[PDB]
Amino acid sequence: KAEDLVEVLKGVSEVMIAAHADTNSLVLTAPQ
Amino acid sequence: KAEDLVEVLKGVSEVMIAAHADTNSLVLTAPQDIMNAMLEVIGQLDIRRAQVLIEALIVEMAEGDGINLGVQWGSLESGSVI
Amino acid sequence: QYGNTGASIGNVMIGLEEAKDTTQTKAVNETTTTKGDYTKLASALSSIQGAAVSIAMGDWTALINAVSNDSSSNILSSPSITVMDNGEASFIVAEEVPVITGFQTVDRKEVGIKLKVVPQINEGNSVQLNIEQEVSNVLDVRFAKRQLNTSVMVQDGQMLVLGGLIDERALESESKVPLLGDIPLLGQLFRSTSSQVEKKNLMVFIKPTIIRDGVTADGITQRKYNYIRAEQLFRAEKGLRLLDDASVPVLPKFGDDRRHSPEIQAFIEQM
Amino acid sequence: IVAEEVPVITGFQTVDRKEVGIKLKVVPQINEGNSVQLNIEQEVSNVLDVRFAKRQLNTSVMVQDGQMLVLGGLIDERALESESKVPLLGDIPLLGQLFRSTSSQVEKKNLMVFIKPTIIRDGVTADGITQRKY
Amino acid sequence: QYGNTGASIGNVMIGLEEAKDTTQTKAVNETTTTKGDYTKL
Amino acid sequence: NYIRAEQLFRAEKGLRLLDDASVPVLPKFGDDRRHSPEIQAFIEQM
Amino acid sequence: NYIRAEQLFRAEKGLRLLDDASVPVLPKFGDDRRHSPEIQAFIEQM
Amino acid sequence: ASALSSIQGAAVSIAMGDWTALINAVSNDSSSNILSSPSITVMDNGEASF
Amino acid sequence: NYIRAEQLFRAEKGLRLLDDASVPVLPKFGDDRRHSPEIQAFIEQM
């Protein structure tokens, strides 16, 4: 689930990680 | 929905993103490059959602039996019972 | 004696004895006669649904009871609410019976069909629906409410099935002596059998239709209007038996607004 | 609002007044010509320990100037059949009706709710409508 | 007897018997007569 | 079509005391609303 | 298939007072819904 | 009736010369056998109530 | 196997008024579920 994954990925990023629930897809923005 | 999308797009923008509910259309204001980025995000978050038909099946089969038999005795003149 | 049956032989025989006319004698030479009450027999028979037949043979009274209860129900109700895109609409058809949750207190709650829908339109054809649909059915009152609230995506003019239930039951029950009830020919004398089969079906379908042009809304409104107008004209052909057939309300022909009664119209032209 | 309020007891029993009747609460805004947009809340009060039926629909529609549009409706149909019999004797064709009890019922109901706006701009239009309703 | 119907044969026959005129006799030679109520019928 | 089949079967052995056209039956799939047979007959005359 | 076996056995010695086609029995695995035998017979005629 | 209601068994009164000897004897043999097994199917690391 | 032994002994001197196949007995260790003897007999026929 995006909600679980975004929370986990916050630390890895530290960039913005946003969870889109209805599509169950998460939007990553970061360098390469 | 614009309300869901605007919330998601806030981070990508960081520019102002405003959700117009009644038309279900969101107003983007940004430079050219960020605009072309958020349109490629919106393009991929706008996809169609498949829909599942959930059919449960519940089976409850009960069965019961019993046999109750016995002989009792009594004499009420001098009260004596089995 | 059996509990499967409507009434048990004990209460029936006791009731019949209480119903007999009793006589009370005091010699020396007084003898009084009195008629007995039926209240015990009436209490025993009140629960009988079926044939309960007492065959008295040699002071042994065999009470036969048999019944076949065949029930059926068929219900179609479809509520349609017309909505602006992205706008929400509630629709309720209900009657509220009194409810006592406690001289007993009564609380009003509503049973009926309610449809709360929030469509949004894919920029052509398919409509997405956030739908909450509830049905109120009512028989110390018990009423059945079967709601489903889901989110579906339906094509423009095509029907889609939101929900359903298919329920089937068979409850068999029996009692016997046992040994005598096993005999094939005479076993039915010592057995009490209670069999039941229930069945139920629920489907909930939804058909959206997208109205864009004014000619589409006029096309739908015209047929839903002319359907009722047809019903009412038929009501006017076989009319009120005791009253004049011009007193039944009937919609004016589509788009013509208000018309005076035939008699009033006749009066108006004179003046 | 057109309504009459019967007494209601929610409890020597206490009575609370509530209103049953036809109420229409509308908030139009006009497309700069013709079509009118309507935010509409429409309720009907019908009343027969008193049970009354209220069927409201509150929606948002867009209607052309002088044309009728159907907000809502219900079409309900019911057939409830019931029977009882001995069984075996009630099966016979000729004498079966002696041992059977049959209860059949058919109910039917229709509700349509339509709305016709009319845009009054000139004074001659308002005078034309008021003159015919008068 | 059936519940589908308006009223069941049991209460009807009981009511009709309660409606009949009852007589209560005490011999030795008193005999009283009395009319029954219709409230059950 | 499963329910419609059930209801057509309900219409073949109908209400014993009432006319068999009074039992509700779904219209054939996609055809929306139909007038009763008698009402339909009336409509064509007018 | 265990329950389906139980129910088929319920259908072999059936309801004594009712027709044996009235006892609910699971369809064969994967076949979804089946019309009753009588209803199915009716459907083929129409 | 209040005295006999509690009898489970054989209570037999033998009256001899105004001395009434009440014999009582019973053997209560009971048994019970119960198997119930509930199975719940779960996603790994997920919890299920049944 | 201790309980299974107890239950088999319950099945040797069984319910006096009922058939001895009605007493619940654990399956042999590791064999999961078994149909009743009569039901099993029925299944093989079909």
GROMACS .gro file of C-alpha atoms in nm, chain C:
model
  271
  115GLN     CA    1  -4.688  -3.529   2.193
  116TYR     CA    2  -4.485  -3.307   1.963
  117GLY     CA    3  -4.361  -2.950   1.959
  118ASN     CA    4  -4.320  -2.925   1.583
  119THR     CA    5  -4.698  -2.907   1.551
  120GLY     CA    6  -4.912  -2.599   1.597
  121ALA     CA    7  -5.077  -2.719   1.917
  122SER     CA    8  -5.002  -3.016   2.140
  123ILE     CA    9  -5.253  -3.286   2.229
  124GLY     CA   10  -5.223  -3.203   2.598
  125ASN     CA   11  -5.362  -2.851   2.584
  126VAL     CA   12  -5.626  -2.963   2.335
  127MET     CA   13  -5.765  -3.245   2.548
  128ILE     CA   14  -5.744  -3.034   2.865
  129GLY     CA   15  -5.927  -2.755   2.684
  130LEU     CA   16  -6.198  -2.991   2.563
  131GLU     CA   17  -6.253  -3.120   2.916
  132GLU     CA   18  -6.272  -2.767   3.056
  133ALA     CA   19  -6.526  -2.685   2.786
  134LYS     CA   20  -6.761  -2.966   2.891
  135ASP     CA   21  -7.059  -2.885   3.110
  136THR     CA   22  -6.978  -2.971   3.472
  137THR     CA   23  -7.236  -3.068   3.733
  138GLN     CA   24  -7.187  -3.035   4.109
  139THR     CA   25  -7.411  -3.244   4.333
  140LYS     CA   26  -7.483  -3.214   4.705
  141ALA     CA   27  -7.706  -3.492   4.837
  142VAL     CA   28  -7.882  -3.543   5.170
  143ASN     CA   29  -8.103  -3.326   4.720
  144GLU     CA   30  -7.937  -3.032   4.545
  145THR     CA   31  -7.780  -3.082   4.201
  146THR     CA   32  -7.637  -2.783   4.015
  147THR     CA   33  -7.527  -2.768   3.652
  148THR     CA   34  -7.282  -2.519   3.505
  149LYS     CA   35  -7.123  -2.464   3.164
  150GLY     CA   36  -6.746  -2.460   3.141
  151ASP     CA   37  -6.528  -2.192   2.990
  152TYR     CA   38  -6.362  -2.221   2.650
  153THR     CA   39  -6.068  -1.998   2.741
  154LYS     CA   40  -5.822  -2.288   2.765
  155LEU     CA   41  -5.948  -2.445   2.443
  156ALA     CA   42  -5.948  -2.102   2.280
  157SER     CA   43  -5.590  -2.057   2.398
  158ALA     CA   44  -5.497  -2.394   2.248
  159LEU     CA   45  -5.661  -2.340   1.909
  160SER     CA   46  -5.543  -1.981   1.856
  161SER     CA   47  -5.202  -2.101   1.735
  162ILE     CA   48  -5.329  -2.358   1.485
  163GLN     CA   49  -5.236  -2.278   1.126
  164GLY     CA   50  -5.352  -2.578   0.932
  165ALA     CA   51  -5.571  -2.881   0.968
  166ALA     CA   52  -5.598  -3.003   1.328
  167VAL     CA   53  -5.846  -3.291   1.337
  168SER     CA   54  -5.923  -3.493   1.650
  169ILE     CA   55  -6.028  -3.852   1.579
  170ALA     CA   56  -6.154  -4.002   1.905
  171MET     CA   57  -6.129  -4.382   1.913
  172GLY     CA   58  -6.174  -4.581   2.234
  173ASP     CA   59  -6.086  -4.283   2.462
  174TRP     CA   60  -5.761  -4.251   2.266
  175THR     CA   61  -5.792  -3.922   2.077
  176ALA     CA   62  -5.550  -3.899   1.786
  177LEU     CA   63  -5.495  -3.539   1.677
  178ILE     CA   64  -5.377  -3.520   1.317
  179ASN     CA   65  -5.234  -3.193   1.196
  180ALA     CA   66  -5.109  -3.105   0.852
  181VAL     CA   67  -5.048  -2.784   0.659
  182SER     CA   68  -4.860  -2.660   0.353
  183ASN     CA   69  -4.766  -2.292   0.365
  184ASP     CA   70  -4.667  -2.165   0.022
  185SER     CA   71  -4.551  -1.804   0.011
  186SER     CA   72  -4.408  -1.580  -0.257
  187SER     CA   73  -4.296  -1.222  -0.299
  188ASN     CA   74  -4.190  -1.019  -0.600
  189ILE     CA   75  -4.072  -0.659  -0.573
  190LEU     CA   76  -3.931  -0.411  -0.822
  191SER     CA   77  -3.869  -0.053  -0.718
  192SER     CA   78  -3.627   0.165  -0.915
  193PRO     CA   79  -3.553   0.521  -0.799
  194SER     CA   80  -3.389   0.760  -1.047
  195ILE     CA   81  -3.228   1.087  -0.935
  196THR     CA   82  -3.112   1.344  -1.194
  197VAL     CA   83  -2.794   1.523  -1.088
  198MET     CA   84  -2.553   1.782  -1.212
  199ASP     CA   85  -2.211   1.633  -1.278
  200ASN     CA   86  -1.985   1.632  -0.971
  201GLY     CA   87  -2.288   1.732  -0.768
  202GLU     CA   88  -2.445   1.509  -0.508
  203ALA     CA   89  -2.809   1.416  -0.475
  204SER     CA   90  -3.017   1.252  -0.207
  205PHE     CA   91  -3.342   1.073  -0.283
  206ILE     CA   92  -3.572   0.937  -0.017
  207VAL     CA   93  -3.905   0.761  -0.041
  208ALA     CA   94  -4.011   0.650   0.305
  209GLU     CA   95  -4.287   0.630   0.563
  210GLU     CA   96  -4.191   0.654   0.929
  211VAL     CA   97  -4.364   0.417   1.170
  212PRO     CA   98  -4.353   0.483   1.545
  213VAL     CA   99  -4.068   0.322   1.740
  214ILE     CA  100  -4.049   0.246   2.113
  215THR     CA  101  -3.700   0.215   2.261
  216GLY     CA  102  -3.837   0.210   2.615
  217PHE     CA  103  -4.648   0.403   2.881
  218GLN     CA  104  -4.377   0.329   2.625
  219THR     CA  105  -4.171   0.592   2.443
  220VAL     CA  106  -4.185   0.606   2.063
  221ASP     CA  107  -3.910   0.716   1.825
  222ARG     CA  108  -3.966   0.789   1.456
  223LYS     CA  109  -3.728   0.632   1.206
  224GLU     CA  110  -3.782   0.609   0.830
  225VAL     CA  111  -3.817   0.297   0.616
  226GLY     CA  112  -3.819   0.336   0.239
  227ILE     CA  113  -3.588   0.361  -0.059
  228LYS     CA  114  -3.303   0.610  -0.037
  229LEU     CA  115  -3.038   0.670  -0.301
  230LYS     CA  116  -2.750   0.911  -0.242
  231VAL     CA  117  -2.527   0.942  -0.546
  232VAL     CA  118  -2.230   1.160  -0.639
  233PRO     CA  119  -2.144   1.113  -1.008
  234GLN     CA  120  -1.851   1.249  -1.198
  235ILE     CA  121  -1.826   1.209  -1.572
  236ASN     CA  122  -1.528   1.086  -1.764
  237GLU     CA  123  -1.503   1.354  -2.029
  238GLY     CA  124  -1.707   1.124  -2.251
  239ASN     CA  125  -1.921   0.818  -2.189
  240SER     CA  126  -1.837   0.635  -1.867
  241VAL     CA  127  -1.973   0.781  -1.543
  242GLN     CA  128  -1.813   0.718  -1.205
  243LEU     CA  129  -2.057   0.679  -0.918
  244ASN     CA  130  -2.004   0.704  -0.545
  245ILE     CA  131  -2.333   0.550  -0.442
  246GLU     CA  132  -2.502   0.481  -0.109
  247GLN     CA  133  -2.824   0.287  -0.156
  248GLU     CA  134  -3.060   0.169   0.116
  249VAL     CA  135  -3.398  -0.001   0.106
  250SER     CA  136  -3.650   0.019   0.387
  251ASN     CA  137  -3.893  -0.268   0.431
  252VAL     CA  138  -4.117  -0.313   0.734
  253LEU     CA  139  -4.354  -0.589   0.845
  254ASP     CA  140  -4.245  -0.439   1.847
  255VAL     CA  141  -4.220  -0.404   1.469
  256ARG     CA  142  -3.950  -0.571   1.260
  257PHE     CA  143  -3.839  -0.422   0.929
  258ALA     CA  144  -3.564  -0.530   0.690
  259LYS     CA  145  -3.307  -0.285   0.557
  260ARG     CA  146  -3.053  -0.398   0.297
  261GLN     CA  147  -2.813  -0.126   0.191
  262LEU     CA  148  -2.500  -0.130  -0.018
  263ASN     CA  149  -2.272   0.170  -0.058
  264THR     CA  150  -1.994   0.127  -0.310
  265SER     CA  151  -1.812   0.303  -0.592
  266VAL     CA  152  -1.863   0.180  -0.948
  267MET     CA  153  -1.778   0.295  -1.298
  268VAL     CA  154  -2.059   0.244  -1.548
  269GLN     CA  155  -2.069   0.307  -1.919
  270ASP     CA  156  -2.292   0.588  -2.042
  271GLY     CA  157  -2.617   0.413  -2.128
  272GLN     CA  158  -2.550   0.059  -2.006
  273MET     CA  159  -2.674  -0.115  -1.693
  274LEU     CA  160  -2.436  -0.246  -1.428
  275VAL     CA  161  -2.506  -0.469  -1.129
  276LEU     CA  162  -2.398  -0.316  -0.799
  277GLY     CA  163  -2.505  -0.586  -0.564
  278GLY     CA  164  -2.705  -0.891  -0.483
  279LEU     CA  165  -2.779  -1.175  -0.248
  280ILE     CA  166  -2.892  -1.528  -0.327
  281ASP     CA  167  -3.009  -1.713  -0.020
  282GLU     CA  168  -3.147  -2.064   0.007
  283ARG     CA  169  -3.256  -2.261   0.311
  284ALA     CA  170  -3.394  -2.605   0.383
  285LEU     CA  171  -3.487  -2.681   0.742
  286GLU     CA  172  -3.615  -3.032   0.804
  287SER     CA  173  -3.723  -3.156   1.146
  288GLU     CA  174  -3.880  -3.477   1.270
  289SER     CA  175  -3.987  -3.659   1.584
  290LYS     CA  176  -4.091  -4.018   1.638
  291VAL     CA  177  -4.119  -4.287   1.902
  292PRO     CA  178  -3.855  -4.407   1.733
  293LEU     CA  179  -3.917  -4.774   1.672
  294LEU     CA  180  -4.282  -4.758   1.565
  295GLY     CA  181  -4.218  -4.456   1.344
  296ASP     CA  182  -3.975  -4.666   1.141
  297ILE     CA  183  -4.243  -4.899   0.999
  298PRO     CA  184  -4.318  -4.792   0.638
  299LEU     CA  185  -4.697  -4.823   0.641
  300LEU     CA  186  -4.789  -4.721   0.997
  301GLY     CA  187  -4.487  -4.502   1.067
  302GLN     CA  188  -4.666  -4.186   0.963
  303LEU     CA  189  -4.897  -4.232   1.261
  304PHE     CA  190  -4.616  -4.191   1.514
  305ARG     CA  191  -4.408  -3.925   1.332
  306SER     CA  192  -4.426  -3.547   1.334
  307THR     CA  193  -4.239  -3.394   1.040
  308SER     CA  194  -4.184  -3.022   0.984
  309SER     CA  195  -4.015  -2.926   0.658
  310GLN     CA  196  -3.941  -2.579   0.526
  311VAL     CA  197  -3.771  -2.432   0.219
  312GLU     CA  198  -3.694  -2.062   0.190
  313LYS     CA  199  -3.539  -1.877  -0.102
  314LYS     CA  200  -3.449  -1.516  -0.166
  315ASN     CA  201  -3.292  -1.306  -0.440
  316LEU     CA  202  -3.175  -0.947  -0.445
  317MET     CA  203  -3.015  -0.769  -0.734
  318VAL     CA  204  -2.932  -0.400  -0.739
  319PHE     CA  205  -2.856  -0.257  -1.085
  320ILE     CA  206  -2.782   0.098  -1.192
  321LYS     CA  207  -2.820   0.269  -1.529
  322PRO     CA  208  -2.679   0.620  -1.571
  323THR     CA  209  -2.762   0.831  -1.872
  324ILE     CA  210  -2.564   1.140  -1.967
  325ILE     CA  211  -2.768   1.446  -2.057
  326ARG     CA  212  -2.562   1.703  -2.248
  327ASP     CA  213  -2.787   1.872  -2.503
  328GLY     CA  214  -3.123   2.017  -2.414
  329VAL     CA  215  -3.284   1.790  -2.672
  330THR     CA  216  -3.173   1.485  -2.473
  331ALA     CA  217  -3.328   1.611  -2.149
  332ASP     CA  218  -3.642   1.696  -2.343
  333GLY     CA  219  -3.641   1.349  -2.497
  334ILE     CA  220  -3.620   1.174  -2.162
  335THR     CA  221  -3.862   1.407  -1.984
  336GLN     CA  222  -4.107   1.366  -2.271
  337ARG     CA  223  -4.125   0.989  -2.237
  338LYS     CA  224  -4.134   0.984  -1.857
  339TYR     CA  225  -4.408   1.247  -1.879
  340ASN     CA  226  -4.611   1.073  -2.150
  341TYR     CA  227  -4.591   0.745  -1.961
  342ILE     CA  228  -4.771   0.890  -1.659
  343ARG     CA  229  -5.007   1.088  -1.880
  344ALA     CA  230  -5.096   0.761  -2.052
  345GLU     CA  231  -5.163   0.598  -1.715
  346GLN     CA  232  -5.388   0.886  -1.612
  347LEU     CA  233  -5.582   0.889  -1.938
  348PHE     CA  234  -5.646   0.520  -1.881
  349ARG     CA  235  -5.765   0.612  -1.531
  350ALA     CA  236  -6.004   0.855  -1.697
  351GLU     CA  237  -6.144   0.598  -1.940
  352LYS     CA  238  -6.252   0.368  -1.658
  353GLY     CA  239  -6.324   0.644  -1.412
  354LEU     CA  240  -6.454   0.697  -1.064
  355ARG     CA  241  -6.769   0.488  -1.051
  356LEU     CA  242  -6.957   0.719  -0.817
  357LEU     CA  243  -6.821   1.051  -0.948
  358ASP     CA  244  -6.793   1.224  -1.282
  359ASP     CA  245  -6.495   1.113  -1.490
  360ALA     CA  246  -6.382   1.475  -1.535
  361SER     CA  247  -6.285   1.491  -1.167
  362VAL     CA  248  -5.984   1.259  -1.197
  363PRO     CA  249  -5.661   1.461  -1.223
  364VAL     CA  250  -5.483   1.413  -1.555
  365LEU     CA  251  -5.167   1.581  -1.676
  366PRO     CA  252  -5.210   1.831  -1.960
  367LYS     CA  253  -5.062   1.739  -2.294
  368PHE     CA  254  -4.689   1.794  -2.285
  369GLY     CA  255  -4.602   2.164  -2.290
  370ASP     CA  256  -4.957   2.304  -2.271
  371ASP     CA  257  -4.958   2.419  -1.905
  372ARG     CA  258  -5.295   2.465  -1.735
  373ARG     CA  259  -5.645   2.384  -1.859
  374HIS     CA  260  -5.984   2.486  -1.723
  375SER     CA  261  -6.224   2.204  -1.648
  376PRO     CA  262  -6.455   2.110  -1.935
  377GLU     CA  263  -6.763   2.258  -1.764
  378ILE     CA  264  -6.577   2.568  -1.645
  379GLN     CA  265  -6.431   2.611  -1.992
  380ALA     CA  266  -6.781   2.587  -2.134
  381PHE     CA  267  -6.898   2.852  -1.889
  382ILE     CA  268  -6.611   3.087  -1.975
  383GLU     CA  269  -6.695   3.099  -2.346
  384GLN     CA  270  -7.052   3.209  -2.272
  385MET     CA  271  -6.948   3.513  -2.066
   0.00000   0.00000   0.00000
